[PDB]
Design a protein around this ligand. Structure first.
Ligand SMILES: CC(C)COc1cccc(-c2nc3cc(C(N)=[NH2+])ccc3[nH]2)c1[O-]
Ligand SMILES: [Ca+2]
Ligand SMILES: [Cl-]
Length: 223
């Protein structure tokens, strides 16, 4: 997260770290056995780490559970990143409490101007790599479709939305991919891509979760 702030330990109880011997992507807990992340964060050998704050220290509250299966969206396109969503089922269910809790799926899509919270352990510099030990947070508004398409002409599908600041300085970045964009207590986006990090006129692009609620529900129900 570039231009963000320290969230505070466990203030984002649905945030998870996908780990394969190091932190590589973020994700969101939606029920005690399922997490949602981005399809391009897929790999085998994934351990889901819940209740984390400092990812390099066991401070307490952590639950490390292996993934039993990852379900990448059948229409995911690695070249355009269209349908960049993946569901991970956990080997055992997580114990939910106040430090580990799930976030709700939306019933409607959010509108431009809606303010949302993006969190993650991704890079904090737009030029160079500086990864943090604790969770970083950023409040960012959803932008209008016209400003998003003007910024990335030909690359935005109806399953993506832009959120951020056109002046630059605040944005999600590498290491944040797969994590949550929460607005009014509902999971509305998944960190997906962007051009560099916090560059002027190049806001972040997120997977539009409201277009996948029936797919998420039907898939969890049959697995
Ligand atoms: C499969 C992963 C281990 C590799 O993931 C990645 C490798 C290189 C860059 C990214 C990445 N750049 C990103 C930029 C942004 C942004 N809003 N500017 C957001 C997420 C990003 N994720 C990324 O997610
Ligand atoms: Ca820790
Ligand atoms: Cl266009």
């Amino acid at each position: 997260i570039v231009g963000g702030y320290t969230c505070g330990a466990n203030t984002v109880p649905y945030q998870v770290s996908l780990n394969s011997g190091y932190h590589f992507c973020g994700g969101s807990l939606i029920n005690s056995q399922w997490v949602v992340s981005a399809a391009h964060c897929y790999k085998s050998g994934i351990q889901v780490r819940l209740g984390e704050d400092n990812i390099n220290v066991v401070e307490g509250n952590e639950q490390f559970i292996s993934a039993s299966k990852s379900i990448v969206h059948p229409s995911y396109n690695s070249n355009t990143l269209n349908n960049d969503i993946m569901l991970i089922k956990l080997k055992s269910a997580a114990s939910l409490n106040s430090r580990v809790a799930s976030i709700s799926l939306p019933t409607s899509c959010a509108s431009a101007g809606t303010q949302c919270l993006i969190s993650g352990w991704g890079n904090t510099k737009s030029s160079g790599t500086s990864y943090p030990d604790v969770l970083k947070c950023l409040k960012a508004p959803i932008l209008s479709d016209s400003s998003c398409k003007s910024a990335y002409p030909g690359q935005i599908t109806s399953n993506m939305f832009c959120a951020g600041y056109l002046e630059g300085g605040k944005d999600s970045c590498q290491g944040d991919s797969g994590g949550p964009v929460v607005c009014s207590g509902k999971l509305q986006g998944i960190v997906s891509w962007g051009s560099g990090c916090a560059q002027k006129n190049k806001p972040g692009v997120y997977t539009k979760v409201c277009n996948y609620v029936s797919w998420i529900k039907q898939t969890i129900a049959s697995n």
